[model samples]
Every structure is written in structure tokens, then in C-alpha cells.
Target: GLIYAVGGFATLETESGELVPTELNSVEAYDPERNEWSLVAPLSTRRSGVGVAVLNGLIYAVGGYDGSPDGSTHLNSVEAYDPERNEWSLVAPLSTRRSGVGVAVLNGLIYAVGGFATLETESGELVPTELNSVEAYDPERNEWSLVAPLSTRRSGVGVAVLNGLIYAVGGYDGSPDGSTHLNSVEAYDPERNEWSLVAPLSTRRSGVGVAVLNGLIYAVGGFATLETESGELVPTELNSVEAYDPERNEWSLVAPLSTRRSGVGVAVLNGLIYAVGGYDGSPDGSTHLNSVEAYDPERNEWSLVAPLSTRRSGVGVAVL
Candidate 1:
């Protein structure tokens, strides 16, 4: 039996020769017994970079972006979907509106990590800004409380719980106009409500996906840029993967993803890691990918799986 479920972004191409964003409300179930995906009820709202977690047998969908042209308009609203009843209901709004934030369940509470907020301009351009605040939500009390803030302000980061601690991985920082991809990794202990720097990733990246299996944290494919002195966006993409060993405080190179991608969704099932849809290549020339690949830790091998129904990036997936 799986403990959670995973869902996130998919990509779709329009007939007009334009790459459009696809928000996935369609749910899929991973049956470990057969090693396949089964369809389930779709979400009411479709957005990318959303959060998904199983609480008391129900799945919660948190804030995300609507794939606007300018990337403005963050989400604060929260919704919960009951699989058994095939229903979705609105929940309390987040304390702040954010996109690309990280969410994980710990000690009977949901913790939301740093993400970006959208600022609307008079000219109608939506700008994205990074955030550092962290918050915890208690479903039983239906309340949210501020926790320790992140050491670095970032968005497109990944969060995972391992051995009673929270690990926040690589993301982009600063304003969209002057943002920089980061390689830093930080860990937070809920018992102490404090954060400490951990071993940084070998490569700087944002929109990376992360998963924990066999006491190791696996950081997957993400994009990076070669910035000029003026800090302008450049055309570049990354295909590297890295694994961190918390016990030894060390990182080792892993097999690179077959297709270079960022904003992918990652989940661990049946002792293997699965990487889902993401943006491949550069932003201006990037293509959304529907391909899914699985990694075997013990064998150190990668195998292609069934492609996602849609091509997308910036999604969330959980296994149940």
C-alpha cells in the first residue's frame, strides 16, 4: 500500500503552433501491485506548481499559478478533494498568496515553504517575486501558524521530510527581472523551529524535483542560466541529477535525465523514483515533455515509463 498520491503539471501544444500551459485536475492512481496508473476524479481548478498531500485519507490542493503570460497572479485559496466520495470542497485560504511553494505533511500538520508571489502592474503585466516565510497548517484546528522563515528567499524549490526534518532544495531567487538560480540546500527541524545550511547541490538549478528513498534525497533535472553582468535571462537548460546522503553529508553524481527538463514532478513508488512532465530546453525555445522516467537506486539505472497524457511543467505528485 502507498502512503500518498502525486499530481502536478502537464504540457500541451495548441494548433496555432504555440506552447500552452496545461493544468492537471485529472488524478491518477499508482497501483504498485501492477506497476501502472489508474485514473480518478479530476480537480475543480487546474493550475501548475500546486501542492498535494494526503491527510486523513483525503487529498488537499494548495496554491499555484494560473500560467499567465506575465506569470502574475498567485493563489491563496485551498481546496480538499475526497477520493472516496469524489468531491472537492473549499478550505481556508493561505496566510499569503504564493506559487511554486513547497508543501509536506509532518507530525500531523502541513508545512508550506518559500515560494513566489505575483504583483500586478498598471500595464497589465504580472510580475513574480520570491518569498521566505514558512507556515504550518493544522487540519484538525483548521488554523495556520507562522514557522521559522527560510534562510534564502526562493521559488520553484522542492521540499521533503526525512528522519523528522524538512529539506528545502534548489530554487530561483530575487525578482523575475533580476533573479538568479541557486544551489543552496537548507534543513529545518520542526522541534526547534530553526534552519541550518546543508550540503549545497553540485549544480545551481531551479524548477527541480526532489524525492526521498532509502535514506537519500534525490534532486532531479532543473534549468540554469548563464547570466551576464547585467543579470539578464539567458537561454540555457540543465540535465544533471544529484543524490545527497544526509548521514555522511555528501553528494554524488547520478545518471542524467534522458531529456533535459525543469519543473518536473517526482515521486517514489515500489523502491523506484519517477520523474514526470517538465519544460525541456530553454524558456524561449523550450518544449513541454510528457515523458515519464523511473530510476532504480539499487541498480543505478533509468527506465522509460508510459508518457503523461499531457505535456506540462511545475506540477505536484504524491503516491498513495
Candidate 2:
């Protein structure tokens, strides 16, 4: 019942080489019983950095950076796919265009939160500025409504729902240009219609991925995103890992990745956490990945798994 609504992804080799977002409409679905992946219906539009959620047996694809050649910019388009029928259709779009939007489904409604909205600079350059905007989608009405914005403007962090509140953690804050990369964490309560600041991560990271396993938040691999006092971007890879316990309201370090990666996809399957292909920060600064690995909290260790046929980063992962 799991379908992967993907678009190919970003390449993260940000040293002397600049990292750029690549848009793709390719999507695939995986069959665990057969241990295989088959091509499925693609998104209505080509995009990368989008957020996805499942509700009432349908897959919902939200905001991200998209378009072809020079059209690459933020998008607000929302699409829905019915796996049973194998079809895609347009739904309501966000009020504003955004990339790296965070989405979570709760009580039959989907919430689209903080992201970076694209802006055209004076030089005709496209830049993604962080946003605090939040919107919610109602399947019953098939419309999107504005909601309270996030406390911090973030893109590319992990979003997971626990109990009734949705959690947003670590991402790049894109507005001020050099103010990229984050270690802050916040939680939104649907019933209360607000977001509260949660405990911060011990490290500052962007390109990190998150998932909820056994009622705890797992924040995995990312690079060291730093700007010197002069405001020059310096991107470095990280294997450092951490986990958060909502019950105690705290975060603790966990085992790190064998291969340092960024912009990863995290999923929970067969009771273990799977960290799929991401931006592989190889020593040569010239690599991406299709290799997959799994972490068993019971064993507190990570091991290799069957690799994906192709490498991808900034992929949308779901358990159907």
C-alpha cells in the first residue's frame, strides 16, 4: 500500500562547487512483499523539495521548487493521487508559493507549514527566502485555509506528528541569505492552533532528516553549514545523529551514519528506521547515493540494505 511520489533531487556538494536544485517528476512505488519498485503515476508537474502526506487512501504532494530550464522557482501547487485507481489530479494550491514546505496530517486534515518562498533578485537571480506562513488542507472540502505561521522560517527539516501536535525541527532559514542552517525545534498544536518552542538540538544542521520511532524523534545525518564572520557559505557533511523524547521533552545523541549524507529520506518499516539515499558527501566532493541503510533502536546500530536502483536526495518518503 506504500507508493513513493518522487521527483529526482538536489545535488549537495557545496564547497567550491555550488549546490543547485534539480526538478524531476519521476515517481515510484515499492512492494515490500516482492522486494521491488515499479514505476507509478508521476506528479502533475515536475518538482523537487516538495512535502507529501497520506489521508483517506490518497497521496498528497505539496509545495517545492520546480519548473524547467530557467523556470526553477518556488511553487504552491498541490496534487493528489489515488493509488487504487493509479491517477493524479489537481487539488487546491497554497496561498503562497514555497519550497521545502513542511507537511503533516492530523485528524483527517493536512497542515502545510514554514518554508522558503522564492524571490527574484535585482540581478534576475532566484533566491528562496524563509517564511513563517502555514496553511492547512481539508480533504472534506478539498480547499486550503491559512493557519498560524511557524515561529521560525525554515525549510528542509524533519516534520513528524506525535499525539495531537506536529513537530518541526532543524532546517535552513533562508530569508537573510547567510542565515542558513538551523538547530531550533518547534511544535504545533492543532487544537490550540499554535506552535511552541521545543528543546533545541545540540548541533546546528541543515539537510538533516527526521522520523518518529517508538514515540521518539530521530534526527539523522547532515553537513556542517557555516558562514564565517564575513558571511561566506561553507557546507560540510555530518554523520552526527540525535533523538528526541517528547515525554521527557529532551533530545539525546544517537548512532551516526556509516556514510555522511545530507537531504536524506527517513522511514519506519518492519519496526526499524530506514535512512535512504541522500547527498553522499564523499571525500572527492563528487558523489550522490542510491545506497540504503536501516537502524534498529533495539540493537542501537545501523546496517546496509538493498540499495535503490538510482541515487536520490530530498526524496518524499511515506509508509502506506
Candidate 3:
């Protein structure tokens, strides 16, 4: 019932303590019926941790980090790719530059949620800063509107819409120097223009991926701390997968991921949840994985799928 397109970061950390961000622009599509991955037209901009969603039969790519570590750049640009035309076109830019954001489509309006923007670094330099702001894009009017800001400032968060409400999940707060993973979960009601707190995640992690299948929301693997930022390279990669049932307002542990990962991309198709490429292990000594796996809710089992053409983290996936 769905077709997915994947793209994002590749490359891993070396023993020498150098951070490498892979330059990946290529896109791939997964066909459930054929069980294959097909290469698609590459994005004009090569970035990672981008937000993606499908609207009107097209996929929208929103904000991500680009360039190298020494010259890292956060983007506010938005682009739309038409599968029919096999082409990408620029759209209204986001009001803010961010990465690790979440996106969803409701009533033809695209809502972009909590992400980070470039901030100032040491020595009076600037880098990305996490934001709590929210914005909406109207495709028909080709305009953007500022919405109510999130209750917490975070990045690497999870978002989903159910029963006309949007839920924002676990992510990191603070800075790379002293970042803190969060277990907080909040929900927004568009009709009420208000937000309400929900049950918190059992684990605190950032760079995680999320998806809804069979009327439940699943939050998957991500890192638990910023130890890697300090050159310690201690990774908190999670193998645990948690599911939330709105009907019962309860959380339960599901099958764990076969591999520990963060910054992964997830999408649901044909009653299966697909988890794509991400960083495996610690930041100081991590490996970018090309592994792709799928979870079947009915069987509560995971099976390997075709590996991605390029290994990456912080990527985005959308179904059409």
C-alpha cells in the first residue's frame, strides 16, 4: 500500500577522532510487491537528518545539515520531487534552518516540527542550535505560517499524527558540549491550538526514528548521550523498540532491532516497518551501516531487506 524513497548521511568515525559526514545525494525507492530497491534521481542538495513527507503524490524534503564538519551548514531550504516527472523543484523555504526535524501531512498542510538550527561555536564561531518552533506549509497557496512553538527545544525527535493530533517524542536538549537526552512526550491538537503531555519514553534517546503501524506508534533506536562529542566515543545506541497504543493509552516493549543504531529512517509499507541506514556503535569509533531491516507486527519478528545503496544516518524516508 506504500512506496518509499530513502536518502541521508554515510561514513563513520575513525580511530584518529575525526568526524566524517558522507556526501550522499542519491535516492532509492522500495517496491513492496517486487521486494527491490530502485535508484531514483538524486537530490539537488546533499544533506543528512532531513525531514520528509508525502503530499499530493509528491515527496517534500525539508531542512538538514550539509557540508563538512569544519564547514558544516544548517539549511532552511525545502524542495519537492515529483515521481511522475522524475524531477525536483524548490518550494517555499522554511522560516528557520534546522536538522533532525519531524514532518507530517494533515489535510494537505505540511507541518514541520522541533529541530535544531546553527548556533555559535567556541572561539566566537557559530554552529547549529536546537529549536522548539513549528511551522506549516500550505501547498495550494505556496505559503508558510508560523505555528505554536513546541514545549521543549529538541532535535532528533519523533513525530506522528493520530486521531487528528500530532505527537512529538524523545530527543536531545542542551548543547553538544553538555547535551541531555529526553524521555518527554507531548501531543498537539490542531483544533484546540494547544499541547498536552503524554506518557514519557522509557528510554531517553536522540536521532531515533518512528512510525505508526496497525493503529500504534513505534519509537525505534537512537543514541542516549553526547559522550561521543567529548571524544570519549561512548555510544548509547539502543536496541529497544517501544510501542504506544493510543486506544489504551499504554506503552509496551516490542521486538528489539537486530542492530544498535541512531539517526535511522523508518516508513511503513504493506503492514511492515522498514528501518534503514544509520550509525552503528560509538561516535568516536562508529560505523555507518547500509543494513536495512523490516518488522512485521503480526509475527512480532524482524527480517533483513535489501541493503541501501549507500550507508547513511540522519536521512529521511517517505511513502507515496
Candidate 4:
């Protein structure tokens, strides 16, 4: 199996010593057997906070935000990558423009879960809001339709399929400034077209990395904030790891990553969960990381892996 990392955001230093935020369009594949990443065809649109999933052997890139300095553009466009041809083709887009969306594939349909979307209010004001709405795509029909919504509005949510159910994990719920980092977990049942609350994570996590292995759902590194005595919210990047057992409906702590990060990309391949590039919450600087790590469930530990050529955060990962 090959692991692919899609579009994300990174900070670039200009010639004049100024740093600029940039969105990525390039795609790369990690060949675990060779321990190397090879560049592949790029996305047509530069994107950050993108959602990615694999269906019918094709990798689908979903809604995300364009990392622009002037003003960011939220995207509703969707595209699919054909590995055999090394090309990408546009597909039917979502009804709402979103970033930090969670995507999963179940029973031939792709589900796009909660994320951030800009809403126009009755007062003619545009407000960036967290969404609880959900949508699913029918590949055969090339169409997307609304589905039952989540109980809590969330963005940067981690999603995975387990035991015929789609689980939407921890994320940020509310406006960026005064948001609630969530540890809430919910499962969507397609048979009844409804979502139900499940046992939540031990800690609040936003921009978390999630994957399933050995019948367990693993939630990886993500950042949360801590309020100080001064009433200031300080950002803290987490290196903790936890796994949920569907049979028991419980989450247990597992070995953590060596590096603290958020917005990381995760994928399962050959019995290992790969944690790709992401942002390391460094107080001194903006650290978009190129470092990678892999977790061995049997060993119950994590190990360093070969890094990417460039730093990335808010990336999308999938196995094909």
C-alpha cells in the first residue's frame, strides 16, 4: 500500500527575511518499503485544511481553505486523483464551502462532515462559523446530497470508519477566537441516517489525526489551549495518543509521539499508522514540520520515519 499526502499550508521565508503564509498544491506518495516519498501530480487548487478520502481506487480531495495573505477563500470544489494516469480530475463539489472538514468512505459513498463555513447573516454580514451539517457523495451518480447533521458544530475534526459506522472525532467547535476545542465523539449510522453521541476523548483536541487499525480507532496529536491566571489562552501542542475500542465503547491512552503537533495527516498502511507533516506549536517561531512518525499497535509504541522534502500542516492523507 502507498500513502499519499495532499495539499496543505506552510510558511515560506522571503528573500528579504519576511515570512509568508502559502498554501500547497503538490502531492507526494510515501513508499514505506523504500522509506521514501516521491512527488506526484499536484492539485489544481492550492488548499489548506483539505479533506481527503479514497474511493474506487481513486483519491478524492474535498473542500478546504485557500491560504491567502490578503483574504482566504473557502472552497467547496472537489477533485479526484487517478494514480494510474498520474492526473487529477474535478468532481461534483459540496453544497457548502468548508475548511477543516472531515471525510470518510463507507459503503461506496464519501461522507464530508463538520467544518468551518462562512455564512451570510440576515444583517448582510459574513461570519465564519463552525458547521454541524453533513453531506455525502455518490460516486456512481457524481452527485452530493445533505445528510443528518452532527449534534455539535465542529471543524478540524478527525473522521474514520469503524464497524460499518462513520465516527467523527475531536475538533474545534465555534469561532476561531473564542472556540471550544472538542473531545466529543459521534457516530453516524447510515441505515437510520442519524448521528449519535459516543464516549468522548479524555482531552480536547483540535486538528487531530485519526486512523483505524486492528479494530481500534486511534486519535493522534493535536493542540489545545490552556487558560492562565491572567486569563490568557495559551496554545499547547499535544504529543499524546489514544485509542478507542468500539466493542467496549472506551478510549485508552497509548504511547505518544516524540514531537508535539497539530493539523497532522494520518493513514493506515501495512499494520502501521503513519503520522505525516504538521505544525509544531513553537512559541519562538512558526514551525510547519516535515517530520513523520509511525505507530506499531502490536508494540504499542511509535517510531520516527523518513521526513518529507518540505514542511506541511493541515495536510490530507490516504492509503491507496
Candidate topping TM-score: 4
Tens digits of per-residue lDDT for model 2, 1-320: 45363664745445688876556676777665675667788887877677877788888888887645676478889888888888889998888887777778888898887777767789999765787888899988888898888888888877888888888888887555555678899998888888999999888877777777898888888766666789996677777789999888898998888878877777777777777777765568536666677798998898876666656776676666
Candidate 3 pairs with clashing backbones: 9-312, 49-314, 117-128, 117-129, 118-127, 118-128, 119-127, 119-128, 120-126, 121-125
Write model 3 residue lDDT over 217-265, tens digit each, in one string: 8998888853455578455788789998887777789999998888888
For residues 51-160, write the lDDT of model 1, one tens digit per residue: 76667777777788776565436788777877668777887778988888888788988888888896667998976669899888899889878999999999889888
In candidate 1, how many Å is residue 95 off?
A: 0.8
Instruction: Tell me each candidate's RMSD, in Å, in order.
Output: 4.0, 4.8, 4.5, 2.0
Judge candidate 3 at residue 79 and give its lDDT: 87
Q: Indicate the worst ten consecutive residues by lDDT in candidate 3.
A: 226-235
Task: List the global CA lDDT of all models.
Answer: 0.78, 0.77, 0.82, 0.93
Instruction: Give residue 30's lDDT in candidate 1 (0 to 100).
Output: 56
lDDT of the structure predicted as candidate 1: 0.78
> Clashes in candidate 3: how many?
10
Off by over 4 Å in 2: 1-5, 10-22, 119-128, 177-179, 226-234, 281-286
- In model 3, the runs with Cα more than 4 Å from the true position are 1-3, 12-20, 69-72, 119-128, 176-179, 226-234, 283-286
Q: Write the per-residue lDDT of candidate 4 for residues 85-116, one digit (tens) a residue.
A: 99999999899999999999999999999999
Backbone clashes in model 4 = 0
Please give the distance, in angstroms, between residue 269's alpha carbon in candidate 4 and its true position after superposition. 0.4
**TM-scores for every predicted model:** 0.86, 0.87, 0.89, 0.95
